[PDB]
Amino acid sequence: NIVMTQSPKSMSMSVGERVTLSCKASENVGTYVSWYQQKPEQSPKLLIYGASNRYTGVPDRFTGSGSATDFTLTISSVQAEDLADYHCGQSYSYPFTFGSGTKLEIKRADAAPTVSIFPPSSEQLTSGGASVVCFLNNFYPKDINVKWKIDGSERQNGVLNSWTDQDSKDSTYSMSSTLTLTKDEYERHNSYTCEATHKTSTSPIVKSFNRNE
Amino acid sequence: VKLEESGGGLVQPGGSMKLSCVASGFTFSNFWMNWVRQSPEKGLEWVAEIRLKSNNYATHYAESVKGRFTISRDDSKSSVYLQMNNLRTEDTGIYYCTSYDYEYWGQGTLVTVSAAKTTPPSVYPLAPGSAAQTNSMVTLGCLVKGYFPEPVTVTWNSGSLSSGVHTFPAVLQSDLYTLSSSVTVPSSTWPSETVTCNVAHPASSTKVDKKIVPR
């Protein structure tokens, strides 16, 4: 099977800059290479076929070049709408194969998260569970850390985190963190805190509640 | 051009499932058609191809599915099909029908191969604590816990609230998924202008609409 290799996994570009994406084939595939753009929760879209032919309706900032074993997709001036994962694929020989994709991140100014904490609902407590949720929304850059404290002491067990893909409209990221306890344990403590630490400050953004409130 | 996919969901290991896709907006009978699948572990993979009446609808299959899957087409219905048999957990992923060169794609459907049982979601409201501070904006949410399989879809006010929404990818823990969604609206508008999350779970035939009311 022909292997299509793409590296690096990600590139971070400012709007207006030029970016060149590379794709290496493990065998000579002639000009039978296509490029696809995939945004999250969407199917891929054809950009380039036959190594260098721009598909109908694709903006002219997209070009493709190369042949045999090395192929390039160039975006002459990155636009915010170009936030996506770009894959090459070969149709020279069966099985047809795709490259692993290079993600394009759009650079923006640093932004601290907006942090919100939520206590367990009465419905969940009735079933015996107690999830405390913290949203860390609309921040940049992507890396961030959450620390959960119960009555001032750190708790790491029971924490579930999920991160969104980069937001198409404002180039930010968001994260949700859920600390799940049993009702039994939740009712034995008083204060619940999430602390968000982000590159914008070594001082954590702290949100908390207590069960007396 | 539209490729409209049908089918998908949960199937037991060793079981069978058929996917369908109806084409409109290209001359279907003149196009080779493919199935492609996608997973986090393995990325995009080509699955099968089917050609034209002039060449007896000859096929090609990926080695990993040969002898277990059948691609077929009904030109009179402008439709392509994938019959999957003796399914394995490594077959789980998002399946797309596509035309040649992957020019046209269906929307994709998640096939989950697992012996775990369908479980509907519990949908819990996220409303701020009574002693939470004041701001010109308020963030509300819904916690969607304990369902299987994926996917669930989340909307707010049946889709009329979208600008302030973040819904987070699900995470799996011991045969059950958990997801959350937040929405941020001007604080003068809640609770006076109601905010409800709608969580649809087609595998369990369950949609839950949870109105978020103050604590």
Side-chain angles (χ1 to χ4, degrees):
Chain A
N1 297 4
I2 301 172
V3 171
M4 308 296 287
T5 297
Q6 291 181 262
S7 179
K9 294 177 179 179
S10 74
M11 275 179 299
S12 190
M13 298 283 117
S14 302
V15 171
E17 301 281 34
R18 151 173 88 251
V19 67
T20 288
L21 307 198
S22 285
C23 166
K24 188 105 183 51
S26 67
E27 303 281 348
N28 179 357
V29 296
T31 64
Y32 295 89
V33 168
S34 296
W35 287 91
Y36 305 89
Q37 177 191 64
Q38 188 175 36
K39 299 180 176 187
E41 308 192 321
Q42 299 185 7
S43 313
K45 290 185 171 62
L46 177 62
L47 298 176
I48 304 291
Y49 66 95
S52 63
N53 304 107
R54 181 184 308 100
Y55 181 61
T56 300
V58 174
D60 57 10
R61 67 185 90 120
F62 290 96
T63 58
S65 64
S67 67
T69 55
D70 296 81
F71 301 84
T72 286
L73 178 72
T74 299
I75 311 175
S76 61
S77 178
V78 158
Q79 297 308 116
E81 61 201 285
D82 298 335
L83 174 42
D85 195 341
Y86 293 86
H87 297 258
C88 60
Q90 67 83 19
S91 57
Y92 174 68
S93 188
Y94 295 93
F96 298 160
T97 51
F98 291 91
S100 45
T102 297
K103 281 194 169 83
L104 176 57
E105 167 185 69
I106 308 295
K107 272 194 196 298
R108 61 152 287 145
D110 296 332
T114 296
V115 185
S116 303
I117 190 167
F118 299 91
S121 63
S122 59
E123 291 92 343
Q124 187 186 21
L125 290 165
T126 295
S127 74
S131 291
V132 193
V133 177
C134 264
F135 294 118
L136 294 67
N137 286 345
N138 301 86
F139 60 85
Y140 186 96
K142 155 93 135 160
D143 296 292
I144 196 160
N145 199 1
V146 181
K147 185 177 309 314
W148 282 97
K149 295 175 175 170
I150 174 49
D151 291 337
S153 298
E154 183 173 334
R155 171 78 60 111
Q156 328 198 86
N157 181 246
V159 177
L160 186 39
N161 297 324
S162 182
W163 302 261
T164 58
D165 293 310
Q166 191 177 26
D167 182 271
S168 49
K169 189 39 66 220
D170 72 356
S171 302
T172 68
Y173 296 93
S174 298
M175 177 194 175
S176 173
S177 187
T178 301
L179 169 64
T180 295
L181 293 317
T182 58
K183 170 166 174 187
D184 199 351
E185 292 194 348
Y186 173 73
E187 299 285 351
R188 293 179 193 264
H189 303 93
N190 314 103
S191 70
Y192 292 85
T193 298
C194 67
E195 303 186 344
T197 176
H198 183 247
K199 167 208 124 77
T200 46
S201 183
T202 59
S203 300
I205 299 179
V206 178
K207 298 294 176 180
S208 67
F209 64 90
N210 62 67
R211 291 189 29 260
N212 291 312
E213 292 169 336
Chain B
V1 173
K2 194 132 93 155
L3 283 165
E4 180 64 31
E5 289 184 44
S6 304
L10 176 61
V11 52
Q12 46 298 305
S16 292
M17 174 171 279
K18 189 190 302 168
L19 271 41
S20 309
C21 163
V22 53
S24 56
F26 63 97
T27 307
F28 179 81
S29 316
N30 292 333
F31 281 70
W32 299 358
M33 299 294 293
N34 298 302
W35 290 88
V36 170
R37 64 187 184 185
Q38 187 171 26
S39 60
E41 323 86 60
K42 199 196 191 317
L44 289 161
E45 292 176 90
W46 169 82
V47 177
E49 176 196 278
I50 189 164
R51 299 187 178 188
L52 311 180
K53 180 76 196 173
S54 63
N55 281 93
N56 312 84
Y57 302 124
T59 54
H60 289 85
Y61 292 92
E63 309 92 290
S64 58
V65 310
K66 188 67 150 312
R68 300 183 308 112
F69 290 10
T70 299
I71 186 172
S72 62
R73 61 195 295 161
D74 186 332
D75 286 348
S76 72
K77 277 157 172 165
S78 299
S79 294
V80 66
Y81 306 93
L82 185 71
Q83 175 71 60
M84 303 180 286
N85 312 279
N86 292 297
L87 276 159
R88 303 168 173 170
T89 88
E90 55 266 43
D91 297 316
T92 118
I94 300 182
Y95 284 69
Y96 308 91
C97 57
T98 318
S99 68
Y100 178 79
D101 190 33
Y102 318 134
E103 169 175 21
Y104 301 128
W105 290 73
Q107 79 278 13
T109 187
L110 182 64
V111 174
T112 300
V113 181
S114 177
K117 303 302 279 208
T118 300
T119 307
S122 294
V123 181
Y124 298 128
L126 305 175
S130 40
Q133 89 290 16
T134 50
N135 185 80
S136 68
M137 299 301 277
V138 66
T139 295
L140 306 175
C142 279
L143 174 63
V144 183
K145 283 211 75 205
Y147 65 94
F148 190 82
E150 273 264 274
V152 298
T153 59
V154 182
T155 59
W156 287 91
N157 286 357
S158 302
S160 64
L161 288 178
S162 61
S163 300
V165 173
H166 300 290
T167 124
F168 297 85
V171 179
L172 182 71
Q173 300 276 356
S174 98
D175 287 335
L176 295 174
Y177 285 95
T178 297
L179 169 157
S180 60
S181 182
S182 67
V183 65
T184 302
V185 300
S187 61
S188 42
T189 76
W190 178 87
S192 54
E193 297 169 45
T194 67
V195 178
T196 299
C197 73
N198 324 99
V199 177
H201 187 227
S204 71
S205 299
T206 315
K207 184 167 154 278
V208 178
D209 318 295
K210 196 76 195 187
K211 181 161 74 164
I212 312 303
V213 300
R215 301 172 61 96

Coordinates of all heavy atoms in Angstrom, one line a residue, chain A residues 147-156 179 189 191-193 195:
Chain A
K147 N -7.2 23.2 37.7 CA -7.1 22.5 39.0 C -8.4 22.6 39.8 O -8.9 23.7 39.9 CB -5.9 23.2 39.8 CG -5.6 22.5 41.1 CD -4.4 23.1 41.8 CE -3.2 23.3 40.8 NZ -2.9 22.1 40.0
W148 N -8.8 21.5 40.3 CA -10.0 21.4 41.1 C -9.6 21.3 42.6 O -8.7 20.5 42.9 CB -10.8 20.2 40.7 CG -11.6 20.4 39.5 CD1 -11.3 20.0 38.3 CD2 -12.9 21.0 39.4 NE1 -12.3 20.3 37.4 CE2 -13.3 21.0 38.1 CE3 -13.8 21.6 40.3 CZ2 -14.5 21.5 37.6 CZ3 -15.0 22.2 39.9 CH2 -15.3 22.1 38.6
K149 N -10.2 22.1 43.4 CA -10.0 22.0 44.9 C -11.3 21.8 45.6 O -12.4 22.3 45.2 CB -9.4 23.3 45.4 CG -8.0 23.6 44.9 CD -7.5 24.9 45.4 CE -6.1 25.2 45.0 NZ -5.6 26.6 45.3
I150 N -11.3 20.9 46.6 CA -12.4 20.7 47.5 C -12.0 21.1 48.9 O -11.0 20.5 49.4 CB -12.8 19.2 47.4 CG1 -13.9 18.9 48.4 CG2 -11.6 18.3 47.5 CD1 -14.9 20.0 48.3
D151 N -12.7 22.1 49.5 CA -12.3 22.6 50.8 C -10.8 23.0 50.8 O -10.1 22.8 51.8 CB -12.7 21.7 51.9 CG -14.1 21.5 52.1 OD1 -14.9 22.5 51.7 OD2 -14.6 20.5 52.7
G152 N -10.3 23.5 49.7 CA -9.0 24.1 49.6 C -7.9 23.1 49.2 O -6.8 23.5 48.8
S153 N -8.2 21.8 49.1 CA -7.3 20.7 48.8 C -7.5 20.2 47.4 O -8.6 20.0 47.0 CB -7.4 19.5 49.8 OG -7.1 19.9 51.1
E154 N -6.4 20.0 46.6 CA -6.5 19.6 45.2 C -7.1 18.2 45.1 O -6.9 17.3 45.9 CB -5.1 19.6 44.6 CG -5.1 19.2 43.1 CD -3.8 19.4 42.5 OE1 -3.0 20.3 43.0 OE2 -3.5 18.8 41.5
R155 N -8.0 18.0 44.1 CA -8.6 16.7 43.8 C -8.3 16.5 42.3 O -8.7 17.3 41.5 CB -10.1 16.8 44.1 CG -10.9 15.5 43.6 CD -10.7 14.3 44.5 NE -11.1 14.5 45.8 CZ -12.2 13.9 46.4 NH1 -13.0 13.1 45.7 NH2 -12.5 14.1 47.7
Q156 N -7.7 15.4 42.0 CA -7.4 15.0 40.6 C -8.3 13.8 40.1 O -8.6 13.8 38.9 CB -6.0 14.6 40.4 CG -5.0 15.4 41.3 CD -3.6 15.4 40.8 OE1 -3.2 16.2 40.0 NE2 -2.8 14.4 41.3
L179 N -15.8 17.7 37.3 CA -15.4 16.9 38.4 C -16.6 16.2 38.9 O -17.6 16.8 39.3 CB -14.9 17.8 39.6 CG -14.8 17.2 40.9 CD1 -13.6 16.1 40.9 CD2 -14.5 18.2 42.0
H189 N -18.5 17.8 51.9 CA -17.6 18.9 51.8 C -18.4 20.2 51.5 O -19.6 20.2 51.2 CB -16.6 18.7 50.7 CG -15.8 17.4 50.9 ND1 -16.2 16.2 50.4 CD2 -14.7 17.1 51.6 CE1 -15.3 15.3 50.7 NE2 -14.4 15.8 51.4
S191 N -16.8 23.7 50.0 CA -16.4 24.6 48.9 C -15.8 23.8 47.8 O -14.9 23.0 48.0 CB -15.5 25.7 49.4 OG -14.2 25.1 49.7
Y192 N -16.2 24.2 46.6 CA -15.7 23.6 45.3 C -15.2 24.7 44.5 O -15.8 25.7 44.3 CB -16.9 22.9 44.6 CG -17.3 21.7 45.5 CD1 -18.2 21.8 46.5 CD2 -16.7 20.4 45.2 CE1 -18.6 20.7 47.3 CE2 -17.1 19.3 46.0 CZ -18.0 19.5 47.0 OH -18.3 18.4 47.8
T193 N -13.9 24.5 44.0 CA -13.2 25.6 43.3 C -12.6 25.0 42.0 O -12.0 23.9 42.1 CB -12.1 26.1 44.1 OG1 -12.7 26.7 45.3 CG2 -11.4 27.2 43.4
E195 N -9.7 26.3 39.2 CA -8.7 27.4 39.0 C -8.2 27.1 37.6 O -7.7 26.0 37.3 CB -7.6 27.3 40.0 CG -8.1 27.4 41.4 CD -6.9 27.5 42.4 OE1 -5.8 27.1 42.0 OE2 -7.2 27.8 43.6

